[model samples]
Target: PNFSGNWKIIRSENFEELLKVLGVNVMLRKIAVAAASKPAVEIKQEGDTFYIKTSTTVRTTEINFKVGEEFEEQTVDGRPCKSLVKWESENKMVCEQKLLKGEGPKTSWTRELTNDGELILTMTADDVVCTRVYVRE
Candidate 1:
């Protein structure tokens, strides 16, 4: 299945732990992990390059990258990091992010589609892993 689509987060698991590991403030983490904050992802793909927009009730973040290329990226919480995206398989995309400065857990995420066509995003920080399930919008 092509990964280019409009997707909305339907459910998530262990997201609060990820926020805590990222050093987000407690107040913000609560809001971020709330059920009401479900986010939508808009993905545009052109050959080896991709433009992804993540939208929530409060903010929108745009990310652009090419496969196998490293680039600077800012996290949703404003942390500066270096990121690289790669294809693990025809249907699976993996992204790894390392902090540019300071000590923190390196993060990685994978996006894969289920047989039923739902998008599954699994994110890891330290030993904490969060899964967000999305459906086409």
Candidate 2:
């Protein structure tokens, strides 16, 4: 998947529900809904390796991972967690994160390219799943 273009978030089907499961308060959700913005990802592909950089006003995150390989990754928000990322398939990427803080199970986030040329990011943790849809510009 060539995820190099500018993308925007259209809607999050169960993002709020997932946030609730994450223990986010109602006031935080309201603020997040009003202030939340879609993150921009710039990906550069070289052979079987990829360098992905995601940037937003609040934070910026980067990942350098190759297909069929696993590496430790820090959470984007600077949480004390180590994540293992690998490509599940040609168009699917998955990450399993283990946090050092909080009593939560390992979290997994998957990204897949849809048939309609959209990118769908699905995150699951503690029996809750949140999905965010993105369309290229």
Least lDDT summed over 10 consecutive residues: which range in candidate 2? 71-80
Residue 51 in model 2: lDDT: 84
lDDT of each: 0.83, 0.70
lDDT of 1 at 46: 88
Predicted candidate 1 versus true structure: per-residue lDDT over 1-137, tens digit per residue = 76789998888888888889989899888888763257779998887788988887766779889999998887546678899989998778899888888867778888887878998989888899999898988
What shift in Å separates residue 99 of candidate 2 from its native position after superposition? 1.3
The regions of model 2 sitting more than 4 angstroms off are: 68-78
